[PDB]
Design an enzyme around this catalytic site. Structure first.
Site, PDB file in Angstrom:
ATOM      1  N   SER A 123       4.413 -39.667  -9.220  1.00 57.41           N
ATOM      2  CA  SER A 123       3.180 -39.895  -8.420  1.00 57.41           C
ATOM      3  C   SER A 123       2.031 -39.019  -8.934  1.00 57.41           C
ATOM      4  O   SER A 123       0.926 -39.199  -8.439  1.00 57.41           O
ATOM      5  CB  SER A 123       3.426 -39.702  -6.966  1.00 57.41           C
ATOM      6  OG  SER A 123       3.567 -38.331  -6.605  1.00 57.41           O
ATOM      7  N   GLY A 155       2.339 -30.043  -3.463  1.00 55.72           N
ATOM      8  CA  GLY A 155       1.962 -28.634  -3.702  1.00 55.72           C
ATOM      9  C   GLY A 155       2.079 -28.251  -5.154  1.00 55.72           C
ATOM     10  O   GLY A 155       1.188 -27.538  -5.696  1.00 55.72           O
ATOM     11  N   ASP A 156       3.126 -28.752  -5.820  1.00 58.14           N
ATOM     12  CA  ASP A 156       3.345 -28.465  -7.254  1.00 58.14           C
ATOM     13  C   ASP A 156       2.229 -29.164  -8.030  1.00 58.14           C
ATOM     14  O   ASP A 156       1.697 -28.576  -8.974  1.00 58.14           O
ATOM     15  CB  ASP A 156       4.758 -28.892  -7.675  1.00 58.14           C
ATOM     16  CG  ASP A 156       5.852 -28.119  -6.964  1.00 58.14           C
ATOM     17  OD1 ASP A 156       5.619 -26.936  -6.647  1.00 58.14           O
ATOM     18  OD2 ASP A 156       6.939 -28.685  -6.767  1.00 58.14           O
ATOM     19  N   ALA A 210       9.048 -27.016 -13.340  1.00 57.35           N
ATOM     20  CA  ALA A 210       8.830 -28.229 -14.157  1.00 57.35           C
ATOM     21  C   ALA A 210       7.788 -29.122 -13.475  1.00 57.35           C
ATOM     22  O   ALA A 210       6.990 -29.714 -14.175  1.00 57.35           O
ATOM     23  CB  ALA A 210      10.140 -28.952 -14.353  1.00 57.35           C
TER      24      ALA A 210
HETATM   25  N1  LIG Z   1      -1.535 -35.893   4.043  1.00 57.30           N
HETATM   26  C1  LIG Z   1      -2.288 -35.409   3.053  1.00 57.30           C
HETATM   27  N2  LIG Z   1      -3.531 -35.871   2.831  1.00 57.30           N
HETATM   28  C2  LIG Z   1      -4.286 -35.394   1.847  1.00 57.30           C
HETATM   29  N3  LIG Z   1      -3.891 -34.405   1.011  1.00 57.30           N
HETATM   30  C3  LIG Z   1      -2.647 -33.857   1.162  1.00 57.30           C
HETATM   31  C4  LIG Z   1      -1.773 -34.317   2.231  1.00 57.30           C
HETATM   32  N4  LIG Z   1      -0.647 -33.616   2.154  1.00 57.30           N
HETATM   33  C5  LIG Z   1      -0.782 -32.753   1.151  1.00 57.30           C
HETATM   34  N5  LIG Z   1      -1.986 -32.891   0.559  1.00 57.30           N
HETATM   35  C6  LIG Z   1      -2.537 -32.190  -0.601  1.00 57.30           C
HETATM   36  O1  LIG Z   1      -1.478 -31.529  -1.234  1.00 57.30           O
HETATM   37  C7  LIG Z   1      -1.710 -30.093  -1.169  1.00 57.30           C
HETATM   38  C8  LIG Z   1      -0.473 -29.322  -0.822  1.00 57.30           C
HETATM   39  O2  LIG Z   1       0.021 -29.735   0.452  1.00 57.30           O
HETATM   40  P1  LIG Z   1       1.440 -29.228   0.973  1.00 57.30           P
HETATM   41  O3  LIG Z   1       1.436 -27.777   0.669  1.00 57.30           O
HETATM   42  O4  LIG Z   1       1.792 -29.973   2.248  1.00 57.30           O
HETATM   43  O5  LIG Z   1       2.410 -29.922  -0.105  1.00 57.30           O
HETATM   44  P2  LIG Z   1       4.032 -30.007   0.002  1.00 57.30           P
HETATM   45  O6  LIG Z   1       4.445 -30.109  -1.424  1.00 57.30           O
HETATM   46  O7  LIG Z   1       4.569 -28.651   0.675  1.00 57.30           O
HETATM   47  C9  LIG Z   1       4.450 -31.442   1.003  1.00 57.30           C
HETATM   48  P3  LIG Z   1       6.261 -31.501   1.143  1.00 57.30           P
HETATM   49  O8  LIG Z   1       6.557 -30.432   2.335  1.00 57.30           O
HETATM   50  O9  LIG Z   1       6.621 -32.904   1.482  1.00 57.30           O
HETATM   51  O10 LIG Z   1       6.996 -31.122  -0.271  1.00 57.30           O
HETATM   52  C10 LIG Z   1      -2.742 -29.891  -0.052  1.00 57.30           C
HETATM   53  O11 LIG Z   1      -3.491 -28.690  -0.261  1.00 57.30           O
HETATM   54  C11 LIG Z   1      -3.554 -31.134  -0.258  1.00 57.30           C
HETATM   55  O12 LIG Z   1      -4.400 -30.910  -1.396  1.00 57.30           O
HETATM   56 NA    NA Z   2       3.838 -38.494  -3.937  1.00 56.72          NA
END
Ligand SMILES: Nc1ncnc2c1ncn2[C@@H]1O[C@H](COP(=O)(O)OP(=O)(O)CP(=O)(O)O)[C@@H](O)[C@H]1O
Ligand code: NA
Ligand SMILES: Nc1ncnc2c1ncn2[C@@H]1O[C@H](COP(=O)(O)OP(=O)(O)CP(=O)(O)O)[C@@H](O)[C@H]1O
Ligand SMILES: [Cl-]
Ligand SMILES: [Cl-]
Ligand SMILES: [Cl-]
Ligand SMILES: [Cl-]
Ligand SMILES: [Cl-]
Ligand SMILES: [Cl-]
Ligand SMILES: [Cl-]
Ligand code: NA
Ligand code: NA
Ligand code: NA
Ligand code: NA
Ligand code: NA
Lengths: 327, 327
Positions: free
Chosen positions: A315, A275-276, A54
């Site tokens: 967001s 990431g999503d 989703a």
């Molecule tokens: N601190 C940051 N600054 C800029 N871009 C970021 C960022 N953290 C994540 N991103 C962006 O989001 C994308 C995916 O990052 P990541 O794979 O860390 O997401 P995530 O969903 O695993 C974080 P979480 O572990 O909190 O759920 C990255 O490729 C980048 O485009």
């Molecule tokens: Na966010």
């Protein structure tokens, strides 16, 4: 009926199909994590809309994607709330299945603000019943959901694995561009079963960990990520993209020399669902006719923007909020 | 509208009004309690209908009571689910309030079956906004819910204390018989605010701990329970019942010599919500014209049946289960 209805003439058939998870997020903010035997009050509570499936559909839907969600929820109020929320986020719900035998999937999330730490218990609930046999029985062996006009399939690893792999195989066999985000990270037995279906994966889009587990190539940075890319082309994936958090991503279009694009520099307040956001945004931009690198560059900007605000799906940007030159 | 509608004449007006809490119980069964930072899956999940207010209304409704629930829930699907469940258990929902600003109240409950330990985070959510001012604004200073026909009010201590205390005072000033089950246990500053309201309580029905905190008598057994009764009569309570778990209950009807009735001898599987079952049953039997002792003997039998099955409201008896002479 909360859900959308198809036309007889296929006139609202989507460009992008997401086959994956819908979970309600029950977020209790606590002064401390409870110890064994403890009854306590939260300081606050927040109800959110999650599941990686989703989340990806909503990222695309919010940018205007012609995206449809295929999933399983309850006949409960949580399921009805999810079906309406998907519609308010531009996602077609005609192929949301409902069972009276199971609650909607949910995550019970405790957050300590002071410590910033989290405890999470995932309760997939109805999701556990989202099998290939149910999917087939409800879609005339995939014919109702894989029309000729369907351009993209997005799957993750948050529903029964056989549903993910059979859908990817069926969509690839019909000339759908298949996108597989192997999240959460596949366990050793899941890796063994994924590897033979990688030839049917048009785009494999893991993070570092997920690339490491599938390839055996330890990914910590750009140089190693380029090795993991070559290894995934060997396992038969056409297009490969590996996200790297604040380091952006690497990719290769159909076996061309890899590329690194670094992360946007932003004040990261809450990276949950970034990431999503990246994956759904990427597929939206490809459906608008961008090539993989142009799509991933804009997905990288969208995900950067998402990390500057709390709220996971809340967001994810709308087009009117984006700086000029993203859309 | 899931909720009932009151009629212009008030032909469906209740005998028993419950002003109190409705919480959904979200129960995640786990192989171990999560450690700080851990994301895990449940082995099983159960959604139950809880909150002491709703538990007491449903105990009465299952026996055929003309009972109405006054509470606040969300506009969310969880609120709609609760409102339907109340109706199916014979509770009128016309004075259920709905807020768009808060979720339905809930408890996030983790159960380790192996270790048989619990962790519970109570999220009162909408309940915290169920204030006297809101209640008065929605009911024309209680006129809509305290009609001349009304025989009984039941309150607990699971909504803002001023709401409970002002409702008791207004109901008692109209000649309604007021029942106050001070659960969960009042804190020292809640004890101080309650004491001046005890003259407006027709029937105080604490457990041993609650009687201890209110009276300063250490209640552990029949003898000390009898002392606690005298202290409560001195604070201006007309009728006292103190429940003693497996040891049954003690009561005095309006200063008369106190009476002990022991627990039924039953295989206790799960005692959860037995007290709520006792309180709701007790008031149903008084609405049928049983005196306090006759009502409490029957309530003791109802609560004993409930301890023999799991599921809280799912363990509350229907009339077919009761021995001859109880109904
Ligand atoms: N601190 C940051 N600054 C800029 N871009 C970021 C960022 N953290 C994540 N991103 C962006 O989001 C994308 C995916 O990052 P990541 O794979 O860390 O997401 P995530 O969903 O695993 C974080 P979480 O572990 O909190 O759920 C990255 O490729 C980048 O485009
Ligand atoms: Na966010
Ligand atoms: N073990 C048992 N055997 C027989 N009757 C019992 C019992 N435990 C409880 N009861 C009945 O229930 C009434 C209230 O009991 P108690 O006050 O322990 O319930 P409770 O809801 O507080 C248990 P829990 O702490 O699990 O929520 C008693 O007065 C009695 O009628
Ligand atoms: Cl529907
Ligand atoms: Cl949300
Ligand atoms: Cl379930
Ligand atoms: Cl928003
Ligand atoms: Cl309603
Ligand atoms: Cl229940
Ligand atoms: Cl809330
Ligand atoms: Na739109
Ligand atoms: Na859309
Ligand atoms: Na009935
Ligand atoms: Na009834
Ligand atoms: Na029980």
């Amino acid at each position: 009926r909360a859900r959308n209805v198809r036309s007889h003439t296929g006139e609202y058939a989507p460009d992008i199909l997401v086959v994956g998870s819908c979970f309600l997020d029950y977020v209790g903010y606590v002064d401390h994590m409870p110890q064994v035997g403890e009854t306590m009050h939260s300081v606050s509570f927040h109800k959110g809309f999650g599941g990686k499936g989703a989340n990806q559909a909503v990222a695309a839907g919010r940018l205007g994607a012609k995206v449809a969600m295929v999933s399983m929820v309850g006949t409960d109020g949580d399921g009805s709330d999810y079906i309406k929320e998907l519609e308010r986020n531009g996602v077609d719900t005609a192929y949301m299945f409902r069972t009276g035998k199971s609650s909607t999937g949910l995550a019970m999330i405790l957050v300590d603000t002071k410590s910033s730490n989290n405890e999470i218990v995932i309760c997939p609930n109805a999701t556990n019943h989202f099998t290939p046999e149910l999917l087939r029985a409800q879609t005339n062996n995939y014919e109702r959901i894989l029309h000729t006009g369907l351009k993209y399939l997005i799957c993750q690893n948050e529903i029964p694995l056989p549903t993910t792999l059979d859908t990817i195989k069926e969509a690839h066999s019909r000339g759908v561009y298949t996108v597989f985000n192997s999240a959460p990270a596949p366990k050793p037995a899941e890796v063994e079963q994924i590897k033979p279906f990688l030839p049917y994966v048009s785009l494999f889009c893991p993070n570092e960990v997920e690339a490491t587990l599938i390839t055996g190539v330890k990914v910590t940075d750009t140089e190693s990520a380029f090795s993991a890319i070559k290894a995934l082309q060997q396992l038969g994936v056409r297009d490969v993209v590996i996200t790297l958090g604040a380091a952006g991503f690497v990719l290769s279009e159909n076996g061309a020399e890899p590329v690194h694009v670094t992360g946007k520099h932003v004040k990261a307040v809450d990276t949950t669902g970034a990431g999503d956001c990246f994956v759904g945004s990427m597929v939206y931009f490809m459906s608008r006719g961008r090539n993989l690198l142009e799509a991933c560059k804009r997905a990288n900007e969208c995900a950067a923007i998402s990390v500057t605000r709390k709220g996971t799906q809340l967001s994810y940007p709308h087009p009117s909020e984006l700086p000029a030159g993203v859309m």
